[PDB]
């Protein structure tokens, strides 16, 4: 009887952890979208700790976790001292690109635009730091679009017009648009819905 | 309108964080009680991260947080290399004793027994590590019961019978009994109740 009670408790804790993960992911996407970067930092710490206390994950929760990891690496995209992979040469934007091409999601025009913007910026942030050999290394791992980028790396022109047309802000805004579609999908999660009900009843 | 929507969202996130804090505290007390120390470690990481994302706390939630901090220091009671206070001389059991005498709770016989057991053990764990000068330092900060303890410190008798009568296990068991009263009080929290309902409907 006491083994079954402990079992019911563990099952209930697994249900609550799954709800908390969904809420933390929604909150992280919202923070990314609003540019509230301190909230994104704190919520990322919370989502990571919650995931370490989970054992089973549904496919939707794994997809959810991958999106949160992508956003974390995009936010750390200019932080070339961040190591997101066991391979220490993989820059944050290269790490986000690997997740982007691995999430089970539709490959619509927005998916491709974000992918191409991340590739250009993975190079541009190396040029911006003066790491011209590292931009060349990044380029060989990611790659007509290709020939212009290699030309820029060899010419060492960091503030090239191409990097302004396909800028970091353009990349962020397109990722924000995608995040808006994800934010609408599960603004319908249990914790968020129940919290919203409480708020609306106190008005 | 968009400022009010952001406001409603922040209020709802504050309601959800408050529910998650309550659930994590219940889960931490349960882990302490069952002696599932890896779960206690992981859940303590989760409760800390959640609290860093909260701004307002009700009195009941502060009391709740204090109990969780006490349990963490009791579990780290034999870890003399743990620093829980800005004063680096305060040992984990001395740190738990300060919280125990600071929680707004009834001072029943169990409260006093736990207090006296923590005081004896704050000394005993220094003797067990061979830190006889540090046991003397701990003794002066905490303190007929007093004269026996000072006699033991000066006699350097680490494996004294007094430390077996008022042992670490006796201290843990009495704290576990208290934790059982706390665990029954808010096994009634929102997240836990709703998770239990889902589990019972899938049986
Ligand atoms: O900062 S990172 O991108 O590196 C990051 C790491 C781990 C995380 O969760 C633990 C984990 C989930 C899945 C597989 C294995 C570990 C993250 C959850 C959300 C957001 C970011 C996360
Ligand atoms: O490991 S410790 O005991 O040091 C500890 C520290 C901080 C914590 O939360 C952050 C915090 C809450 C209240 C005031 C300021 C900070 C803890 C929450 C639960 C359990 C333990 C915690
Ligand atoms: Ca680097
Ligand atoms: Ca596929
Ligand atoms: Ca020490
Ligand atoms: Ca008082």
UniProtKB/Swiss-Prot annotation, chains A, B:
Q: Domains: what does the record tell us? A: The acidic N-terminal domain binds to the ankyrin repeats of TNKS1 and TNKS2. The C-terminal domain binds microtubules.
Localization per Swiss-Prot or TrEMBL:
Nucleus; Cytoplasm, Cytoskeleton, Spindle; Chromosome, Telomere
Q: According to the UniProt entry, which residues carry Phosphoserine?
A: 154
Q: What is the effect of changing residue 19 to P?
A: Abolishes telomere binding
Coiled-coil stretches noted in the UniProt entry, renumbered to this chain: none
Q: What, per the annotation, is the impact of changing residue 57 to R?
A: Loss of interaction with FBXO4
PTM (free text): Phosphorylated preferentially on Ser-154 in an ATM-dependent manner in response to ionizing DNA damage.
Q: Tell me, what does this protein do in biology?
A: Binds the telomeric double-stranded 5'-TTAGGG-3' repeat and negatively regulates telomere length. Involved in the regulation of the mitotic spindle. Component of the shelterin complex (telosome) that is involved in the regulation of telomere length and protection. Shelterin associates with arrays of double-stranded 5'-TTAGGG-3' repeats added by telomerase and protects chromosome ends; without its protective activity, telomeres are no longer hidden from the DNA damage surveillance and chromosome ends are inappropriately processed by DNA repair pathways.
> Mutating residue 32 to P: effect?
Diminishes telomere binding
GO cellular component terms, A-Z: chromosome, telomeric region; cytoplasm; fibrillar center; nuclear body; nuclear telomere cap complex; nucleolus; nucleoplasm; nucleus
Region annotated TRFH mediates dimerization, chain positions: 1-203
Quaternary context: Homodimer; can contain both isoforms. Found in a complex with POT1; TINF2 and TNKS1. Interacts with ATM, TINF2, TNKS1, TNKS2, PINX1, NEK2 and MAPRE1. Component of the shelterin complex (telosome) composed of TERF1, TERF2, TINF2, TERF2IP ACD and POT1. Interacts with RLIM (via N-terminus). Interacts with FBXO4. Interaction with TINF2 protects against interaction with FBXO4 and subsequent polyubiquitination and proteasomal degradation. Interacts with GNL3L; this interaction promotes homodimerization. Interacts with TIN2. Interacts with RTEL1.
Domain of life, per the record? Answer: Eukaryota
Q: What is the effect of changing residue 17 to P?
A: Abolishes dimerization and telomere binding
Q: Which UniProt keywords apply?
A: Acetylation, ADP-ribosylation, Cell cycle, Cell division, Chromosome, Cytoplasm, Cytoskeleton, DNA-binding, Isopeptide bond, Mitosis, Nucleus, Phosphoprotein, Telomere, Ubl conjugation
Q: What is this protein called?
A: Telomeric repeat-binding factor 1
